[PDB]
Amino acid sequence: MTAIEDILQITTDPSDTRGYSLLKSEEVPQGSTLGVDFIDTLLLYQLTEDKPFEYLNDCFRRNQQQKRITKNKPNAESLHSTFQEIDRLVIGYGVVALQIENFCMNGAFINYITGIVSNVNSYTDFLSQIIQRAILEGTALDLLNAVFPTLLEYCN
């Protein structure tokens, strides 16, 4: 549970000892209990609080680092489903954020790709899983038409 709270930098209460993003404001996301069927709801608030793509890539980076952290822990099998569902949903929502222009209301494709070019050494892996998820779905032809002209206009 608390693994998700630091991974997604979100807590219910939440204001104590850290600047984790406040949890607002729907009635259901108020109980002091998280689980398998909650990751979707939390991401729907975080994406729609300026760089949602950078935030999702950082969350994926922390999720990956926590794999190394937790594999050497006695309870790596209990949270295995948690990590699998995080890798599913965070990746799905990262693709969605770069699937249509009007999904994330703060931060545009030009803003994402600008930082991507600035620090591509950190996005070069997450974008791989992005394309891997997109390909088998088949809805990637439009995104090949959406992402490239963005960098084109940036460079122009």
Parallel, antiparallel, or unpaired: how do β-strands 10-11 and 21-22 relate? Answer: parallel
What does residue 32 show for φ and ψ, rounded to 5 degrees? Answer: -85, 60
Technique that determined the structure: cryo-EM
Q: Which amino acid is at 88?
A: R
Q: Which amino acid is at 153?
A: E
H helix intervals, the chain: 2-7, 39-47, 52-71, 80-97, 109-118, 120-123, 126-137, 141-155
Distance of CA 78 to the CA centre of its chain: 22
Both tokens assigned to 27: 């009635």
Nearest to 41 by CA among 54, 57, 28, 59: 28
- Tally of CA atoms within 13 A in the half-sphere of 111 that contains its CB: 13
Nearest to 110 by CA among 50, 42, 36, 25: 50
- Residue by residue, DSSP assigns 17-52 as SS-PEE----SSTTSS---GGGHHHHHHHHH----H
Both tokens assigned to 31: 């109980």
DSSP code, position 103: S
Alpha-carbon distance of 120 to 126, in angstroms, equals 10
Length of the chain: 156
Both tokens assigned to 44: 């729907």
Residues in a beta bridge with 10: 21
Helix (H, G, I), strand (E, B) or coil at 81: helix
Alpha-carbon distance of 47 to 53, in angstroms, equals 9
